[PDB]
């Protein structure tokens, strides 16, 4: 009746977020700490966007010469330890945030390292500053904090117990995955579908998907895990779709094969979903299917599910879609 269920993925794949929902969904209140945490993310984002406008090629000129002093303001605060968050900050954040040349630099975000609660929280500053404010669940799900360590969540669905194991999703953090490899029922590998134009932090060279592609491989072909079948969450489906539709940067450019690609017969396209979006979300699935397929020996199998983490409505659905397969 008990299911030691370990949770893997690259950096910022979306793990402690799925952890998040399982708690939202299946577990029984002074979030006042998590506010401070949100606040932090705001600084973090805006500093990071201004920062690289200069650092970029081409460089990126502020829409409004006025904002230049605000720029200056920001980086005069950038490394402060215990920050106090005075009201000017938000006036100046919003300002830069309003600046079109800033928002045009946002458009080149794939070209440097930036958290994906960016737009979302920047879009809602005024709400954040009110000292009576309490974060929506949406907001609370997006507060991003480095996972240094490993954390045991435990829950129950229809009196069936779960043991969620969260790991550090970065290079130096994977040395300690092993400790979860024995006495594991099955795996959740979480992947940031949308990060096909970006490189990872660890070196700032390796393409994030490509990284996670050949992390998958290293697990699906692992010595202590030829039994254990792996549930793949193709995470971040909203963002993905967005980029595809946005059409701005082409996929085949980042993964040259997409160009020879056509669209799968078992195609189960979301209702009203775009045929070109449908192409990529699956195509990406099939880059992982070329790994799961190419070995394992009908001795374990791959469960691919398109997912958005920050979507309890999609999450419950796919977790149901999952408690299911634990039976077998």
């Amino acid at each position: 009746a008990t299911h030691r269920l370990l949770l893997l993925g690259a950096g910022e794949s979306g793990k402690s977020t799925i952890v998040k929902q399982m708690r939202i969904l299946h577990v029984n209140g002074e979030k006042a700490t998590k506010v401070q945490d949100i606040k932090n993310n705001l600084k973090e984002a805006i500093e990071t966007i201004v920062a690289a406008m200069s650092n970029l090629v081409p460089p990126v000129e502020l829409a409004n010469p006025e904002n230049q002093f605000r720029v200056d303001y920001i980086l005069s605060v950038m490394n402060v330890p215990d920050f106090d968050f005075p009201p000017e900050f938000y006036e100046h954040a919003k300002a830069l945030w309003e600046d079109e040349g800033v928002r045009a630099c946002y458009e080149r975000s794939n070209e440097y390292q930036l958290i994906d609660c960016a737009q979302y929280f920047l879009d809602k500053i005024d709400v954040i500053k009110q000292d009576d404010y309490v974060p929506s669940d949406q907001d609370l799900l997006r507060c991003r904090v480095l996972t240094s360590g490993i954390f045991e969540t435990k829950f129950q669905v229809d009196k069936v117990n779960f043991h969620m194991f969260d790991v550090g999703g970065q290079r130096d953090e994977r040395r300690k995955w092993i400790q979860c490899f024995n006495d594991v029922t099955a795996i959740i590998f979480v992947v940031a579908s949308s990060s096909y134009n970006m490189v990872i932090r660890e070196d700032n060279q390796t393409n994030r998907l490509q990284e996670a592609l050949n992390l998958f491989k290293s697990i699906w072909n692992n010595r202590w895990l030829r039994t254990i079948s792996v549930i793949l969450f193709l995470n971040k489906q909203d963002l993905l779709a967005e980029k595809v539709l946005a059409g701005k940067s082409k996929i085949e450019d980042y993964f040259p094969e997409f160009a020879r690609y056509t669209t799968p017969e078992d195609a189960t396209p979301e209702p009203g979903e775009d045929p070109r979006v449908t192409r990529a979300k699956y195509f990406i699935r099939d880059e992982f299917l070329r790994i799961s397929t190419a070995s394992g020996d009908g001795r374990h199998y791959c469960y691919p599910h398109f997912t958005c983490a920050v979507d309890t409505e999609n999450i419950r659905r796919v977790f149901n879609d999952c408690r299911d397969i634990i039976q077998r």
């Binding site: 490899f181 024995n182 010595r223 202590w224 895990l225 030829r226 039994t227």
Partner: protein, 190 residues
């Protein structure tokens, strides 16, 4: 069993761990031919191996001039601390014969902690019973941070003792790193 090799290890609790070393051993080492040395060593050690049984300690291993044993293995005991004590007790007594029987000033340096362990065997070939945990390292690091022909003991090993023993501050932190650095209160025995 089909993907990890089977693991011959069992967690154990409330066990006293001992380490002991030979002060100024290399003075003896330079003295005697590799042969007639081995003898005096294999001598004392089998005697140590013996008191062990008297004192209720499963011996672990010999690592050159280093000996170590434990109390609470294989099977639990309440007196567990007292045993590893009564062991050290007999060992400096024992080694004193070998001071007379040679003439060189070779002696001992005990160190004893009490905590959790692990125990069993590793790999496939040539098994030897063994123990592992910080608590263990700690005992070892107290063989390191001991003083000659005096028995060393921790915070914990006092607590499993019920002061039937007269003792005093060793303050081992001023001998060995790991002690100091981990806030360790050490004691000697009278």
């Amino acid at each position: 069993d089909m993907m990890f090799h089977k693991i011959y290890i069992q967690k154990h609790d409330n066990v006293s761990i001992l380490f002991a070393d030979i002060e100024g051993f290399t003075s003896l080492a330079s003295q005697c031919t590799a042969q007639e040395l081995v003898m005096t060593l294999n001598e004392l050690f089998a005697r140590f191996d013996k008191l062990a049984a008297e004192n209720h300690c499963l011996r672990i291993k010999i690592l050159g001039d280093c000996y170590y044993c434990v109390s609470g293995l294989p099977e639990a005991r309440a007196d567990h601390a007292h045993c590893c004590v009564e062991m050290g007790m007999d060992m400096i007594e024992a080694i004193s014969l070998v001071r007379e029987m040679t003439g060189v000033n070779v002696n001992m340096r005990v160190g004893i902690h009490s905590g959790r362990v692990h125990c069993g065997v590793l790999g496939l070939r040539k098994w030897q019973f063994d123990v592992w945990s910080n608590d263990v390292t700690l005992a070892n690091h107290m063989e390191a941070g001991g003083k000659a022909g005096r028995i060393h003991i921790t915070k914990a090993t006092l607590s499993y003792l019920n002061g039937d023993y007269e003792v005093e501050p060793g303050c081992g932190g001023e001998r060995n790193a790991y002690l100091k650095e981990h806030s360790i209160e050490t004691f000697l025995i009278l």
